[PDB]
Design a binder for this molecule. Structure first.
Ligand SMILES: [Mg+2]
Ligand SMILES: [Mg+2]
Ligand SMILES: [Mg+2]
Ligand SMILES: [Mg+2]
Ligand SMILES: [Mg+2]
Ligand SMILES: [Mg+2]
Ligand SMILES: [Mg+2]
Ligand SMILES: [Mg+2]
Ligand SMILES: [Mg+2]
Ligand SMILES: [Mg+2]
Ligand SMILES: [Mg+2]
Ligand SMILES: [Mg+2]
Ligand SMILES: [Mg+2]
Ligand SMILES: [Mg+2]
Ligand SMILES: [Mg+2]
Ligand SMILES: [Mg+2]
Ligand SMILES: [Mg+2]
Ligand SMILES: [Mg+2]
Ligand SMILES: [Mg+2]
Ligand SMILES: [Mg+2]
Ligand SMILES: [Mg+2]
Ligand SMILES: [Mg+2]
Ligand SMILES: [Mg+2]
Ligand SMILES: [Mg+2]
Ligand SMILES: [Mg+2]
Ligand SMILES: [Mg+2]
Ligand SMILES: [Mg+2]
Ligand SMILES: [Mg+2]
Ligand SMILES: [Mg+2]
Ligand SMILES: [Mg+2]
Ligand SMILES: [Mg+2]
Ligand SMILES: [Mg+2]
Ligand SMILES: [Mg+2]
Ligand SMILES: [Mg+2]
Ligand SMILES: [Mg+2]
Ligand SMILES: [Mg+2]
Ligand SMILES: [Mg+2]
Ligand SMILES: [Mg+2]
Ligand SMILES: [Mg+2]
Ligand SMILES: [Mg+2]
Ligand SMILES: [Mg+2]
Ligand SMILES: [Mg+2]
Ligand SMILES: [Mg+2]
Ligand SMILES: [Mg+2]
Ligand SMILES: [Mg+2]
Ligand SMILES: [Mg+2]
Ligand SMILES: [Mg+2]
Ligand SMILES: [Mg+2]
Ligand SMILES: [Mg+2]
Ligand SMILES: [Mg+2]
Ligand SMILES: [Mg+2]
Ligand SMILES: [Mg+2]
Ligand SMILES: [Mg+2]
Ligand SMILES: [Mg+2]
Ligand SMILES: [Mg+2]
Lengths: 67, 200, 131, 169, 122
RNA sequence: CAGCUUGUUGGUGGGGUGACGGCCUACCAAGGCGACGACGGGUAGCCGGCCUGAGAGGGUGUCCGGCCACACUGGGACUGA
RNA sequence: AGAAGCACCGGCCAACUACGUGCCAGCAGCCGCGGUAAUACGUAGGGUGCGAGCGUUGUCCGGAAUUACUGGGCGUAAAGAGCUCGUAGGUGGUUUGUCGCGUUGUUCGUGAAAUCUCACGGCUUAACUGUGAGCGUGCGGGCGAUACGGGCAGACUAGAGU
RNA sequence: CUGGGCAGUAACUGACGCUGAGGAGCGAAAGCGUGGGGAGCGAACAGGAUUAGAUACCCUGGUAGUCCACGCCGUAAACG
RNA sequence: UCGAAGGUGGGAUCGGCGAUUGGGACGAAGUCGUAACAAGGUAGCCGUACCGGAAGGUGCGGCUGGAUC
RNA sequence: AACAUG
């Protein structure tokens, strides 16, 4: 996506009525100042001002890239 | 509203003499009317209902007013039958009855309603005024040298005075020591069947 | 397969308490062994020991009965299943037979009871009831 | 001198070659009023004869009910055939909040502060057996310390120990 | 059943019908009351029931029952219709309020007299 | 109701605004979203609260208080903090 | 002295007899009552429940554990797919170390006012109203704990497979 | 030609497991398509009897079908 | 350039009416048989085929929730 | 063989 990365975040939280911990996943967009990120790739993010219609995040650094 | 009807009739139906001393009762202790001498089915609801009626026609309290007394009695700590009979014993017309200033309950209600009393120097005319601890219950200077207030000057002995209040000499005034707990309450009625009535 | 070995641990104790067996053996883990220490300190079982199997180890519990054939353990219930975990805070810990039972609480300070976690002011995962 | 309540009197029927032969059953609760209660069914051709076999049956089947001084010691849930009765202790200002079948079992046993709810079938005979089944599940604080080998001060909560001190001094 | 099934598919409360339609929110609803006639009840319990086919301002045509003995409804009397069902009449879910727009109250009532419509005494 | 999406999703240079931004424009890339319900259809101002209930829940949004939307219907700008 | 009425009385569910009517007239929330001795229809007397109100209809929750998290079921009452393979998903044996996301402790910030609970005050009392404290179950920031769940880095052979 | 199971040895791998919404495959008998084959049996149909009638049961015949090759069908009190 | 309202066009989608016709529920003392419940007078039910005023009959496979000597 | 109905 040409200086843009897509990151699948995930977070777990109780069900309000039943109490089971439900795991869900999001898909946010982020900005690569240089296009170095591929499929896999644990990445750390930080949220910013609006950079496009959908980009709200920036790539900080890559820790333990795609094995 | 008040009841303003026959008084022996609702002591015969409830099978309990609610006023103090009655020769019309104990000639007929069975319920009134034309089917009075029956041997009736004693329902569990009947034992709870007629127990609640024994307190409404002792104290002279309507049903919506008696229910609001239950609303706070169940909501205060302690018990529920203790605190319901406490706040019924704290009403001003009952305090005048316990002090000996009136022969019956209904004449205790008019002497409060007609404004013959004060409490803290304040002219009151509401019969369900609830006195608190340390409340003086004074009496109007106009109401001295009056027939029903001086006919109760010499009759200060035939009924006992409870421990929680106190009457004094010719300056008639009533001092509340504390709120009455249980033991100095006159008992024609049990106090648990009223509590079980409002759970239905 | 084998999910939840702690619920197996309590079901083995029920199925022999109900059958008046004197002892039970079962595969050993350090969570089953620490639950056996809470059951001994609260007087529900008598002494337990660790034998040795082919592989791993083996936990052996001596059950306790009265002079007459009285169950010294009344019930056993697993609370925090693996399909639904149950956690409690120190202000609203559970309470078994109005306090006549014992809830096994897994706090960060080890395994505790209700009365050991209430006066230390901690909560955790509510493992079991015994009563 | 005892407390007695008849819970239900139904008329049962048997069919013969001539017609229908009727009979009466009369479930009766007989209790001490203090700590003991008994349940007896009893049945006969006439209602007072069916009651009297129930009273004599209920007096030969007493059992002791553990109390604290007005209420039961811990919540229990009893199981008859398909009657489910949940018993639950209460503060001393409470009366006996209970249905009409379980009320007779608890008032004859001398209970004053109870919460009861019947959760299964509505048959008066099986609600009474499920209330009896829950009263057997109750067990004393001094008996749960002999069962565990501890003292009483560390098996019972302190809030109900003081209700033993206040109840008789 | 199995908490993960309740996460995926919850509990759905069962469906009850609108137990008094053709009033549509109103407690009472007036109508024009054509076709005053008389119907028989079901298999037991036989009599001559006095009903009417009233066209409401809910724009519906319903059969309504006339309580009390004797009335004065012909073809175009304004009636006030309430709810209330009659067990032995199968298609009848509405009663006519007596002491209303055109329905005179029941004559010679001295008991209960507030149903069926009647002043005390003159 | 199972395929929706072409200024659509991202980039660059300009424009624009009080301000970030496909907000607009040209060009380049070919993406974005969806069975964790996209796109449709039906209904609804949301909330502090209110009613009920042992609680958990279920129903509701009326007075009063908060925020929002509109001002015959539809569209538009002007002035001005 | 100027000031009481309304409903109900077969069962649930407090409160019963007489006359009139005769499957008629009517009643009824349900079971049902009425066909010549009707405690159920109509009136009367008597009674009960309430009271400046008392009924009725509509609407919501309760009872209803009849959507069941608290708190249900599926051999025969309604309910195990005809049977298997497998995708997403949910769940996962024993053990060492570590992280501190879940979880748990504490503290700060916030969760307006009213309403609600509690305790005092004021309206002659009450409703109403003033103050104080709870509550506001949460969320964010900081600092502790590491048993359990999870992540990461290895070990193991009992499960599984060869 | 080919699939699964059980027991023993404990040689090897080191949690590689269980379940599985959707989906997919298999799935008695009847039936459908094309092409064969057709002894016996036997829906339909026909006659005979029985009966108030007998569109049935019982009797005499008898077509599809039952068989095979290749596809479709996807249902059963497919049940323990 | 954009642009409301209007015009033209082909579809989508939700309702009402409709000669005639399909079943469904319920009405009383209607008409014609007797299929099920007893071995219900040919054990009954299930799937499927063909046939018959009507229930039903027959074939093929299945089940016992039948087999009474 | 045989036998419907209320
Ligand atoms: Mg017996
Ligand atoms: Mg059961
Ligand atoms: Mg039931
Ligand atoms: Mg462009
Ligand atoms: Mg850019
Ligand atoms: Mg720019
Ligand atoms: Mg740009
Ligand atoms: Mg709207
Ligand atoms: Mg409830
Ligand atoms: Mg508003
Ligand atoms: Mg308004
Ligand atoms: Mg206008
Ligand atoms: Mg300007
Ligand atoms: Mg009665
Ligand atoms: Mg008569
Ligand atoms: Mg009457
Ligand atoms: Mg009033
Ligand atoms: Mg209503
Ligand atoms: Mg309801
Ligand atoms: Mg519910
Ligand atoms: Mg059920
Ligand atoms: Mg099952
Ligand atoms: Mg069956
Ligand atoms: Mg079934
Ligand atoms: Mg099966
Ligand atoms: Mg099937
Ligand atoms: Mg998987
Ligand atoms: Mg594990
Ligand atoms: Mg996992
Ligand atoms: Mg506040
Ligand atoms: Mg106050
Ligand atoms: Mg005051
Ligand atoms: Mg206030
Ligand atoms: Mg914090
Ligand atoms: Mg092996
Ligand atoms: Mg190895
Ligand atoms: Mg599978
Ligand atoms: Mg499937
Ligand atoms: Mg196939
Ligand atoms: Mg075939
Ligand atoms: Mg063929
Ligand atoms: Mg051929
Ligand atoms: Mg023929
Ligand atoms: Mg033949
Ligand atoms: Mg053909
Ligand atoms: Mg072949
Ligand atoms: Mg088979
Ligand atoms: Mg038509
Ligand atoms: Mg037959
Ligand atoms: Mg047949
Ligand atoms: Mg025959
Ligand atoms: Mg037959
Ligand atoms: Mg044939
Ligand atoms: Mg067939
Ligand atoms: Mg066959």
């Amino acid at each position: 996506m040409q200086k843009t990365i897509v990151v699948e975040l995930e977070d777990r939280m109780r069900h309000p009525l039943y109490g089971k911990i439900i795991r869900t996943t999001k898909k946010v967009k982020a900005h690569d100042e240089d296009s170095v990120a591929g499929i896999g790739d644990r990445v750390s993010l930080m949220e910013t001002r609006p950079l496009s219609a959908t980009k709200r995040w920036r790539l900080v650094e890559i820790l333990e890239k795609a094995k | 509203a008040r009841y303003t009807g026959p008084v022996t009739r609702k002591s015969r139906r409830l099978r309990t003499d609610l006023v103090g001393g009655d020769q019309a009762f104990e000639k007929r202790p069975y319920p009134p009317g034309q089917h009075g001498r029956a041997r009736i089915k004693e329902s569990e609801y009947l034992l709870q209902l007629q127990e609640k009626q024994k307190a409404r026609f002792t104290y002279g309290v309507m049903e919506k007013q008696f229910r609001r007394y239950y609303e706070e009695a169940v909501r205060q700590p302690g018990k529920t039958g203790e605190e319901l009979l406490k706040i019924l014993e704290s009403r001003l017309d009952n305090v005048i009855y316990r002090a000996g200033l009136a022969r019956t309950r209904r004449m205790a209600r008019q002497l409060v309603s007609h404004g013959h009393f004060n409490v803290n120097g304040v002219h009151v005319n509401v019969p369900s005024y609830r006195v608190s601890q340390y409340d003086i219950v004074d009496v109007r200077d106009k109401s001295l040298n009056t027939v029903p207030f001086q006919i109760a000057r010499e009759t200060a002995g035939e009924r006992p005075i409870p421990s929680w209040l106190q009457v004094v000499g010719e300056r008639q005034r009533v001092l509340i020591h504390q709120l009455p707990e249980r033991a100095q309450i006159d008992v024609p009625l049990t106090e648990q069947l009223i509590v079980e009535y409002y759970s239905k | 397969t084998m999910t939840d070995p702690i619920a197996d641990f309590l079901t083995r104790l029920r199925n022999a308490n109900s059958a008046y067996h004197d002892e039970v053996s079962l595969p050993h883990s350090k969570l089953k062994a620490n639950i056996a220490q809470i059951l001994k300190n609260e007087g529900y079982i008598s002494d337990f020991r660790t034998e040795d199997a082919r592989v791993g180890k083996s936990l052996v519990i001596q059950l306790k009965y009265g002079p007459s054939r009285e169950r010294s353990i009344a019930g056993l219930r697993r609370v925090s299943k693996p399909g639904l975990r149950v956690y409690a805070k120190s202000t609203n810990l559970p309470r078994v037979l109005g306090g006549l039972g014992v809830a096994i609480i897994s706090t960060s300070s080890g395994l505790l009871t209700d009365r050991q976690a209430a006066r230390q002011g901690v909560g955790g995962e509510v493992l079991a009831y015994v009563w | 001198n005892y407390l007695e309540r008849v819970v239900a009197i139904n008329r049962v029927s048997k069919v013969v070659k001539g017609g229908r032969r009727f009979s009466f059953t009369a479930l009766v609760i007989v209790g001490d009023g203090n700590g003991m209660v008994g349940v007896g069914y009893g049945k006969a051709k006439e209602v007072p004869a069916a009651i009297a076999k129930g009273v004599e049956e209920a007096r030969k089947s007493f059992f002791r009910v553990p109390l604290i001084g007005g209420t039961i010691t811990h919540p229990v849930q009893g199981e008859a055939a398909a009657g489910v009765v949940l018993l639950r202790p209460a503060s001393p200002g409470t009366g006996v909040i209970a249905g009409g079948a379980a009320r007779a079992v608890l008032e004859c046993a001398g209970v004053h502060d109870i919460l009861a709810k019947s959760l299964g079938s509505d048959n008066a005979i099986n609600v009474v057996h499920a209330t009896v089944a829950a009263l057997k599940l109750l067990q004393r604080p001094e008996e749960v310390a002999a069962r565990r080998g501890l003292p009483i001060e560390d098996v019972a909560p302190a809030g109900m120990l003081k209700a033993r001190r206040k109840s008789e001094a | 059943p199995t908490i993960q099934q309740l996460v995926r598919k919850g509990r759905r409360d069962k469906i009850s019908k609108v137990k008094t339609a053709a009033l549509k929110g109103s407690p009472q609803r007036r109508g024009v009351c054509t076709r005053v006639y008389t119907t028989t009840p079901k298999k037991p319990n036989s009599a001559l029931r006095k009903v009417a086919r009233v066209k409401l301002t809910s724009q519906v045509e319903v059969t309504a029952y006339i309580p009390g003995e004797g009335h004065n409804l012909q073809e175009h009397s304004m009636v006030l219709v309430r709810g209330g069902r009659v067990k032995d009449l199968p298609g009848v879910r509405y009663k006519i309020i007596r002491g209303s727009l055109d329905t005179q109250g029941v004559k010679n009532r001295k008991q209960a007299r507030s149903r069926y419509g009647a002043k005390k005494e003159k």
